[PDB]
Design a binder for this molecule. Structure first.
Ligand code: NA
Length: 129
């Protein structure tokens, strides 16, 4: 599914991301925009053989199982395919684990390079929430 901006903001809020670990809703919307262009079915293969999955491009080296990332972990206890669903539950619940690790949203390189420090509230401007 390719979400609209406000559509995703509303879904993320329903799924409990607004102010999760202190990160306002616009941070999560910005991160999704630059990670996946709001497409739940996004995938990208990394040079190390791991793959990033879903609207927040969650990586198989640590967070999910895909059966083809040798030596990796599955800390969200899910198949990586669950991160591609129209239903954002698995992506949200896993992102909550990830952001609760020590580096916060810096885990998402696109957040650090494109969202951090910017007017992230603009991503939710105008949306019914
Ligand atoms: Na894995």
């Amino acid at each position: 599914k390719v979400f609209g901006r406000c559509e995703l903001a509303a879904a993320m809020k329903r799924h409990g991301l607004d102010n999760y670990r202190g990160y306002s809703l616009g941070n999560w919307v910005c991160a999704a925009k630059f990670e996946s262009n709001f497409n739940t079915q996004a995938t990208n293969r990394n040079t190390d053989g791991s793959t990033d999955y879903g609207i927040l491009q969650i990586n198989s080296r640590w967070w999910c199982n895909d059966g083809r990332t040798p030596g990796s972990r599955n800390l969200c206890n899910i198949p990586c395919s669950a991160l591609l669903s129209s239903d954002i539950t698995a992506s949200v619940n896993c992102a909550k684990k990830i952001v609760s690790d020590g580096n916060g949203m810096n885990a998402w390189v696109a957040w650090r390079n494109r969202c951090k420090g910017t007017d992230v509230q603009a991503w939710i401007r105008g949306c019914r929430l």
